[PDB]
Amino acid sequence: KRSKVFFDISIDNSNAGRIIFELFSDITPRTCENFRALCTGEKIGSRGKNLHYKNSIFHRIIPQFMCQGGDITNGNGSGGESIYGRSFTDENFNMKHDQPGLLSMANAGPNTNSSQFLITLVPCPWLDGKHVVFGKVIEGMNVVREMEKEGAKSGYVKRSVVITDCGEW
């Protein structure tokens, strides 16, 4: 039932590698479907462009914490849009942030999921019950560690960390 997707990452125009994710479609089908669709770019957004992670960036990276990206509309953390509209409800919190390499939804409080997500670099139990965990890095965790090095304690990312390609795997 679970499906897989991938991201090809570039740092300042230089390819850093590929990350392959397994989506927990069997636990959070709705949340996973949104992410999958955003990887393929098959849906048309509120504007006239397709909702796609391609060319989007990781705007906030904090070492020993997580990598955040997915702001496909404003690229600074204030935007985002899902295939269900501007936002959608928290599906469930069955999965916890108990290991590094987990995919989780970023939000602005209860039921405000859109397209922003985070990739954990360590367990983040304080996020349990507040963020929906819907995936796992099954390949390329080493690429994620390379991205981590581009971050700062403030979350500021100096170089451009971009998803140059993506889709189902």
Residues that bind another protein (CB under 8 A): 60, 62, 65-66, 68, 71, 77-80, 104, 106-109, 112, 114, 116, 118, 124, 126-127, 131, 155
Give the pair of three-digit tokens for residue 144: 């994620």
* CB atoms near residue 121 (< 10 Å): 22
CB of 158 to another protein, least distance (A): 18
User: Could you tell me if 57 and 161 are in contact, meaning their C-beta atoms sit under 8 angstroms apart?
Assistant: yes
Measured from the CB atom, the residue of 8 and 61 that comes closer to another protein is 61
d(CA 54, CA 41) in angstroms, rounded, equals 8
Measured from the CB atom, the residue of 80 and 101 that comes closer to another protein is 80
Strand partners, 103: 119, 135
Measured from the CB atom, the residue of 155 and 167 that comes closer to another protein is 155
User: Could you tell me if 8 and 21 are in contact, meaning their C-beta atoms sit under 8 angstroms apart?
Assistant: no
CB of 134 to another protein, least distance (A): 14
CB of 1 to another protein, least distance (A): 27
